[PDB]
Amino acid sequence: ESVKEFLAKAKEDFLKKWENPAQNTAHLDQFERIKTLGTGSFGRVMLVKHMETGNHYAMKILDKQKVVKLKEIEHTLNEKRILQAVNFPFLVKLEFSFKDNSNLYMVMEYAPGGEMFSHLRRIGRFSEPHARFYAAQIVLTFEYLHSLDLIYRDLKPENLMIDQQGYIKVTDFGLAKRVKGRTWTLCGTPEYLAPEIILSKGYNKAVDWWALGVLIYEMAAGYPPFFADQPIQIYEKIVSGKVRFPSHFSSDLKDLLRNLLQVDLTKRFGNLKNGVNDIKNHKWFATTDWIAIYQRKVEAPFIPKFKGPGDTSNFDDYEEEEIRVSINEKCGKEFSEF
C-alpha cells in the first residue's frame, strides 16, 4: 500500500531480473511504425502498433554502429538492463526488447500526454500545487530507484512523460546506472548537473536530489535556476551556487530549494541520515498524501486532451527516416547481452 511496503518484494523482484535479464522478446515485423515522437544521439522513439494485439507502444530504435563510434556501449547496455528490471507506477514500462543486424529496439509503454517539457514551455510556469503534484511522484520514484542502488542522472521535463490520467512516467534511462558508492562519469544535462559532477569529484545518488531542486525551480519559475547560452557559462553559475528566486515563490518553496540546491553534501536534503524523509516531511509538502500519490488517487491538475488510440497531438513533429537493416550483422559481440 505504501511505497516502503512495496519496496521489500520489489527489491527482490528487481535483483532477480537484473541478474538474469530478458532478451529477444519480440521482432521488428510484429509492429507497424507510425510516427517519430522524439530523437536522440543514436536514434529515435516512434509510435508503433503491435499488429497482433492492436496495442500502441513507443519504440526506441538505436543504431549500433553510432553507439560504438561515440563510445556509449556501456550506457546503452545499462539503459536496457535497468529498464527491463524495474517496475514502478511512475516509470515507463518496457514491454519488449530485441535487436537485429543494425539496430537495438526497446518497445516501451506509450505515454500519450506528451513530454512535461512541451506543456511547461507552452503554459510558461506551473502553480506551486501543480509543480508539487509532479515533484511528489519524482520523490517517490527516486526513493524506489535509489533503494535498488540506481542513480537516474537525467532528470528534466524532457524525460517526464504525462500519461492519460495526468501522472508522470519517467523515460530515457540512458544515463541510469547501478552503483554502490561513488561514480565518475561527466554526464547529464548542463542545467541539471550537480556541482560535484562538474568538479570531477566522484559522486553518488545525491546528484538526483540536486536535480530535483532544479526541476522544481524550473516547474515553478518557468526557467531553470542556472541558464546561459554556453554550457561552460552554466557550469560556472552552478559551482558558484548563488541561486536567486522569483518573488512569487512561497517561503516554504524557497526553503526546500535552498536545501536541495545545496553545494555541501553533508547538508543536501536527500543525502542526510534521515534520507527521503527530510524532503517528504518538509513544510512545502504538508498537503501531500504520499500514499494517495503512490496509489494514483489524487486528481491530477492537468489531464491531456487525447483523441483516441495512436493520436499524437501532444507531440511535436519530427522528420521521418526509413529504418535500415543491413544484410550483415554489426557489432554483435559488443551488444551480446542486449
Binding site: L70, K71, C187, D229
Partner: peptide, 20 residues
C-alpha cells in the same frame, strides 16, 4: 525580466545530455 531573458536565450528548446 528573468523570464524575458530566458525566452531570448538559446536554451529554451529540448536540451541534450553531455556524455562520456
Amino acid at each position: 525580466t528573468t523570464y524575458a531573458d530566458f525566452i531570448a536565450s538559446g536554451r529554451t528548446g529540448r536540451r541534450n545530455a553531455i556524455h562520456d
